[PDB]
Design an enzyme around this catalytic site. Structure first.
Site, PDB file in Angstrom:
ATOM      1  N   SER A 196      -9.329   1.738   2.621  1.00  0.00           N
ATOM      2  CA  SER A 196      -8.326   2.479   1.859  1.00  0.00           C
ATOM      3  C   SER A 196      -7.232   1.632   1.196  1.00  0.00           C
ATOM      4  O   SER A 196      -6.502   2.141   0.345  1.00  0.00           O
ATOM      5  CB  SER A 196      -7.706   3.599   2.718  1.00  0.00           C
ATOM      6  N   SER A 197      -7.116   0.355   1.559  1.00  0.00           N
ATOM      7  CA  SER A 197      -6.152  -0.531   0.883  1.00  0.00           C
ATOM      8  C   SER A 197      -6.722  -1.101  -0.418  1.00  0.00           C
ATOM      9  O   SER A 197      -6.596  -2.292  -0.687  1.00  0.00           O
ATOM     10  CB  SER A 197      -5.696  -1.670   1.801  1.00  0.00           C
ATOM     11  N   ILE A 199      -7.809   1.445  10.070  1.00  0.00           N
ATOM     12  CA  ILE A 199      -8.231   2.206  11.256  1.00  0.00           C
ATOM     13  C   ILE A 199      -9.761   2.232  11.396  1.00  0.00           C
ATOM     14  O   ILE A 199     -10.300   2.580  12.456  1.00  0.00           O
ATOM     15  CB  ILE A 199      -7.660   3.648  11.257  1.00  0.00           C
ATOM     16  N   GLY A 200     -10.447   1.853  10.323  1.00  0.00           N
ATOM     17  CA  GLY A 200     -11.897   1.801  10.310  1.00  0.00           C
ATOM     18  C   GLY A 200     -12.428   0.677   9.446  1.00  0.00           C
ATOM     19  O   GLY A 200     -13.640   0.572   9.244  1.00  0.00           O
ATOM     20  N   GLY A 201     -11.521  -0.153   8.929  1.00  0.00           N
ATOM     21  CA  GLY A 201     -11.876  -1.262   8.042  1.00  0.00           C
ATOM     22  C   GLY A 201     -11.031  -1.389   6.782  1.00  0.00           C
ATOM     23  O   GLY A 201     -11.313  -2.241   5.934  1.00  0.00           O
ATOM     24  N   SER A 202      -9.984  -0.568   6.669  1.00  0.00           N
ATOM     25  CA  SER A 202      -9.221  -0.418   5.410  1.00  0.00           C
ATOM     26  C   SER A 202      -8.418  -1.634   4.912  1.00  0.00           C
ATOM     27  O   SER A 202      -7.906  -1.609   3.795  1.00  0.00           O
ATOM     28  CB  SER A 202      -8.323   0.814   5.461  1.00  0.00           C
ATOM     29  N   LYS A 213       0.865  -1.173   0.000  1.00  0.00           N
ATOM     30  CA  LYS A 213       0.000   0.000   0.000  1.00  0.00           C
ATOM     31  C   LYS A 213       0.906   1.229   0.000  1.00  0.00           C
ATOM     32  O   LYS A 213       1.960   1.216   0.634  1.00  0.00           O
ATOM     33  CB  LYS A 213      -0.888  -0.026   1.246  1.00  0.00           C
TER      34      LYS A 213
HETATM   35  C1  LIG Z   1     -12.596   2.790   6.605  1.00  0.00           C
HETATM   36  C2  LIG Z   1     -12.225   4.128   5.962  1.00  0.00           C
HETATM   37  N1  LIG Z   1     -12.698   5.251   6.796  1.00  0.00           N
HETATM   38  C3  LIG Z   1     -13.956   5.665   6.876  1.00  0.00           C
HETATM   39  O1  LIG Z   1     -14.906   5.163   6.274  1.00  0.00           O
HETATM   40  N2  LIG Z   1     -14.026   6.693   7.719  1.00  0.00           N
HETATM   41  C4  LIG Z   1     -15.281   7.404   8.059  1.00  0.00           C
HETATM   42  C5  LIG Z   1     -15.447   7.544   9.587  1.00  0.00           C
HETATM   43  C6  LIG Z   1     -16.710   8.315   9.975  1.00  0.00           C
HETATM   44  C7  LIG Z   1     -16.771   9.690   9.295  1.00  0.00           C
HETATM   45  N3  LIG Z   1     -16.496   9.553   7.834  1.00  0.00           N
HETATM   46  C8  LIG Z   1     -17.340  10.180   6.903  1.00  0.00           C
HETATM   47  N4  LIG Z   1     -17.054  10.151   5.584  1.00  0.00           N
HETATM   48  C9  LIG Z   1     -17.845  10.745   4.702  1.00  0.00           C
HETATM   49  C10 LIG Z   1     -18.987  11.414   5.140  1.00  0.00           C
HETATM   50  C11 LIG Z   1     -19.273  11.439   6.504  1.00  0.00           C
HETATM   51  C12 LIG Z   1     -20.405  12.084   6.996  1.00  0.00           C
HETATM   52  C13 LIG Z   1     -20.705  12.375   8.265  1.00  0.00           C
HETATM   53  C14 LIG Z   1     -21.891  12.989   8.293  1.00  0.00           C
HETATM   54  C15 LIG Z   1     -22.658  13.503   9.340  1.00  0.00           C
HETATM   55  C16 LIG Z   1     -23.886  14.107   9.073  1.00  0.00           C
HETATM   56  C17 LIG Z   1     -24.350  14.205   7.761  1.00  0.00           C
HETATM   57  C18 LIG Z   1     -23.589  13.690   6.710  1.00  0.00           C
HETATM   58  C19 LIG Z   1     -22.360  13.083   6.981  1.00  0.00           C
HETATM   59  O2  LIG Z   1     -21.415  12.510   6.178  1.00  0.00           O
HETATM   60  N5  LIG Z   1     -18.438  10.822   7.351  1.00  0.00           N
HETATM   61  C20 LIG Z   1     -15.319   8.777   7.375  1.00  0.00           C
HETATM   62  C21 LIG Z   1     -12.796   6.952   8.185  1.00  0.00           C
HETATM   63  C22 LIG Z   1     -12.280   7.901   9.075  1.00  0.00           C
HETATM   64  C23 LIG Z   1     -10.915   7.919   9.370  1.00  0.00           C
HETATM   65  C24 LIG Z   1     -10.065   6.989   8.772  1.00  0.00           C
HETATM   66  C25 LIG Z   1     -10.578   6.036   7.882  1.00  0.00           C
HETATM   67  C26 LIG Z   1     -11.942   6.018   7.584  1.00  0.00           C
END
Ligand SMILES: CCn1c(=O)n([C@H]2CCCN(c3nccc(-c4cc5ccccc5o4)n3)C2)c2ccccc21
Ligand SMILES: CCn1c(=O)n([C@H]2CCCN(c3nccc(-c4cc5ccccc5o4)n3)C2)c2ccccc21
Lengths: 544, 549
Positions: free
Chosen positions: A184-185, A205-208, A109
């Site tokens: 992200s991977s 960190i969130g499922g990557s 990656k």
């Molecule tokens: C697995 C990859 N990955 C994620 O999926 N996240 C998420 C985590 C939660 C927030 N996130 C996200 N992204 C896009 C939109 C919103 C969003 C919020 C919202 C609140 C009201 C209304 C609308 C809205 O959209 N939130 C990205 C990560 C965060 C840090 C590192 C990696 C991440």
């Protein structure tokens, strides 16, 4: 945007020259070695591939250039490769002979720093800033005889489970061009999933690690955060420790993950990063055939599983039962709280300020959706919107409020609540005397540009980053036309935009891979893999 | 907030002192019954047994668990009279005596506990009024593991109020005194353990250490202690005043009369029981071969950290052991971790008080502030703008005071992330420095001799030798190597310090009048290398105090 356009032009030229170099190197080798059965080479499971390399039946040169050729070919349809790690051909000749991964080509990656190469993360500010040393895990891969050969694509800034950025563009799922490869991977998912790499490294960190593995029909493991060295990893934000980041292997089978984990867990790693606890790979645990007490849920009551997800889960539950294992209903307590305040608040304790600094003067990739726009909002306005959204759309309101900046004092409070929550789930686990936990894994692959608009669907993965439990995924089935048609009856539990977008995004998925998730307690990677091995053997016996 | 006064705090103090009073009565009454049935028993022979021989005789059956228990209980009661180190008798400990697993590695061993180790039915007050009359619902993890290994936890020992001090007085149980000299501090925050063990009242104890709290009382009281990597042992069930602070890790570890005792305790703790009860602790077994190794070591060393001027006794202690380690065939390499002032003034202080001390101050509402804390509470209560102003005014003439004051201001989550990244980078820096000199271990001065009562809280700079390794999260242990000579003590008249600020002035007076007091050296290894750290400690002990082996 002149600065950002210039960065994109430079990066695309570099990517093009990388692919050209790759193309010329493989053409040279193929012509010099025309009798080599390349198909048989490529279809060899990794374990058999390494045993042939160790014996001398296959040369490291043969394995390397054959995989390079395959990588080049699969990239044409996927756009998964950003960079050819050019010096690899000399590392090839120097590979330690006793190494456990002798002559194995390994994909990395983009965030795994490699001497002389950018780790852009799809961000203009990181373009033309090459790394000046290999990160620790790369050093140990090389000391184990492995040959890192490519950098693979990631979504912009890496906080997305899609896979596009303004620099190298959009990565596509190898099974279906209109589908996301996950992220992200994501590049790793696409490359390994189409046969272009036998083993890769990703971060989570969130499922990557788990998203792209599931979406592309490969195996992946997210270990406990500190089981492996993070030294020299490139990231957007540093010093966030509430929700643990992990790195881990991605491959075509469970055995490949175990081999890679064993190879990494050696004296070299423990010496090069003393901060990593020197826990050797416990072969006795991984190879155990003792019946298991398996906790399971078929829904988390947060993200409604697709019919394909639910069937995948029930079927492996049934097969594990038939094999003599004890299946016990089990759901970690307070999931909405753990996601909405603990996870979201852990990732965004500073309201996204550190994260936003990376985007100054840069394009925002569509695949990130409204993330950046939302984070830029003033804290009072986030609070205000949250108050208005709460009666109607509580999921959106909770996330929005949790994405506001806070004090050090409030961070301590959050970190303490994360510790107490981890304690509470451990207590639950103990009370049921579980060895292991079986869960659904988000799938099938979402349409391109939709992960950024289906945030709730991280519920299945991010929970175990918050808990810092080892979690891996294994492909168990494919979406049938029956499964796919049933998506028309899918409504979600909330009926908010996340549910609406997810419903649409999981349609048109016939023939796509579907996975299940395997979880163990902190530091129990070997037991997590033992259970992954069991799932693999029962659901897809041809893999072993 | 409305002023609530001190009436509740006063009621807590009278209640706590009665519980202490009754504890000691119960103890005394139990041993009198025992002695009346065993006039034959050679008390002072059993008490003089090194722990290893004691456990061995317990295992063979040569000594009964009752005999060693009541003999130590009687000794603990006696040494407490002149030290005030016991807060509570763990009343149900006679039932653990009879339930003690015979195969346990600590079968029949009486163990003393720092008050913060929660024990079922007992307060863990921390000398804080608001924790009085709040009995623990269960034994903490390490206590369960001790019992599962056949040990008999028998007392809770005293701490300075809230544990954020290296003295040992609180308004509830009062002041703990050094067994060597009643005018001297036993050290802290594990001060009770130091005083109890150091006078023969306990063969093994457990303490905690976030800034030196295992090492200070061990050094001051002439016993050995080990501060492991933060997460080598379980923190589950440990009573603390602040939760969620993870920049500077908290550690727990053994205190005893010899390093062999420390190694036994660690080995007994590092078992399936611990790894099961707390899955967050990496299941790292005690590596016997590393501990037992006799290979020559590459030992880094320094005579001073250039921050706290060592006492003449400290400096001599360090040089002597350096010279004896060289005579024994090890190679000694001059080594000082880079950027120590940064590590102390911004990383450690900033990490411990990221919230400006706000969470910490909640514990003191309506409570007395013990004098041994000095001006800590008064300083933390100051508004952020005022700490800033004073810092700017203090900087030109007193940079140490200025930097600490600024770092004790509250900050944003954003700034904490940045600080946490800086601590992590600093850790990689010193590790690389260590590697480039190819060190095995590191030899360091240890603060000593014991400071006069009520002065540690007024000589904050002196934590420099210890908290550096909490910030780095390296295993660090301490061993007694010499005693203060008349010549060592007289040379305190020439002591100036590097800065000449209030901290140096106080320390100069605080270390005088120490003839005959124990002085220690500090032994350090890389993260997770407890066994190697103990191996080095064993070496130091053998060369400096061979009778202990
Ligand atoms: C697995 C990859 N990955 C994620 O999926 N996240 C998420 C985590 C939660 C927030 N996130 C996200 N992204 C896009 C939109 C919103 C969003 C919020 C919202 C609140 C009201 C209304 C609308 C809205 O959209 N939130 C990205 C990560 C965060 C840090 C590192 C990696 C991440
Ligand atoms: C090993 C025991 N231990 C400590 O010694 N500390 C220290 C840490 C640094 C601040 N501290 C302290 N205490 C009293 C006074 C001051 C003080 C500051 C100041 C700034 C300008 C001017 C004067 C001044 O005094 N500082 C207590 C601990 C903190 C957390 C946990 C355990 C601790």
């Amino acid at each position: 945007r002149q600065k950002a356009r210039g960065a994109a032009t430079r990066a695309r030229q570099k990517q093009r020259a990388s692919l050209e170099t790759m193309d010329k190197a493989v053409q040279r080798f193929r012509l010099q070695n025309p009798d080599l059965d390349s198909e048989a080479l490529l279809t060899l499971p990794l374990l058999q591939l390494v045993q042939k390399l160790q014996s001398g039946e296959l040369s490291p040169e043969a394995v390397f250039f054959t995989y390079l050729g395959k990588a080049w070919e699969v990239n044409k349809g996927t756009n998964c490769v950003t960079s050819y790690l050019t010096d690899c051909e000399t590392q090839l000749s120097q590979a330690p002979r006793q190494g456990l991964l002798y002559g194995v080509p390994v994909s990395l990656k983009e965030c795994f720093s490699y001497k002389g190469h950018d780790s852009t993360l799809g961000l203009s500010l990181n373009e033309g800033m090459p790394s000046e040393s290999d990160c620790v895990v790369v050093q140990v891969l090389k000391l184990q005889g492995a040959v890192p050969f490519v950098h693979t694509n990631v979504p912009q800034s890496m906080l997305s489970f899609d896979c596009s950025n303004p620099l190298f563009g959009q990565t596509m799922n190898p099974w279906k061009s209109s589908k996301s490869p996950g992220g992200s991977s994501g590049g790793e998912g696409a490359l390994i999933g189409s046969g272009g790499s036998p083993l890769g490294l990703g971060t989570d960190i969130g499922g990557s690690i788990r998203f792209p593995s599931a979406f592309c029909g490969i195996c992946g493991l997210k270990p406990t955060g500190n089981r492996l060295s993070k030294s020299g990893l490139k990231g957007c934000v540093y010093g966030q420790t509430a929700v643990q980041l992990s790195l881990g292997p991605m491959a075509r089978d469970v055995e490949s993950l175990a081999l890679c984990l064993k190879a990494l867990l050696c004296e070299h790693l423990f010496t090069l990063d003393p901060t990593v606890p020197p826990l050797p790979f416990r072969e006795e645990v991984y190879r155990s055939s003792r019946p298991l007490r398996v906790g399971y849920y078929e829904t988390d009551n947060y993200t409604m599983p697709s019919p394909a997800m639910r069937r995948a889960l029930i079927e492996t539950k049934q097969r594990l039962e038939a094999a003599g294992h004890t299946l016990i209903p089990f759901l970690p307590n307070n999931i909405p709280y753990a996601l909405e305040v603990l996870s979201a608040g852990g990732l965004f304790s500073d309201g996204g300020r550190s994260f936003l600094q990376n985007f100054k003067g840069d394009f925002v990739d569509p695949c990130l959706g409204d993330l950046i726009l939302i984070l830029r909002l003033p804290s009072w306005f986030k609070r205000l919107l949250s108050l208005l959204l709460k009666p109607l759309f509580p999921r959106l309101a909770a996330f929005l409020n949790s994405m506001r900046p806070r004090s050090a004092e409030k961070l301590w409070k959050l970190q303490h609540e994360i510790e107490m929550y981890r304690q509470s789930v451990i207590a639950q686990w103990k009370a049921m005397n579980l060895d292991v936990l079986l869960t659904p894994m988000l799938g099938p692959a979402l349409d391109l540009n939709t992960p950024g608009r289906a945030t709730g669907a991280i519920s299945y993965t991010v929970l175990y980053n918050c808990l810092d439990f080892p979690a891996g995924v294994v492909p168990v089935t494919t979406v049938t036309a029956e499964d796919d048609a049933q998506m028309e009856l899918y409504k979600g539990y909330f009926g908010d935009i996340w549910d609406i977008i997810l419903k649409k995004a999981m349609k048109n998925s016939v023939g796509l891979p579907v996975a299940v998730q395997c979880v163990a307690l902190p530091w129990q990677e070997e037991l997590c893999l033992r259970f992954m091995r069991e799932v693999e053997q029962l659901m897809t016996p041809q893999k072993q």
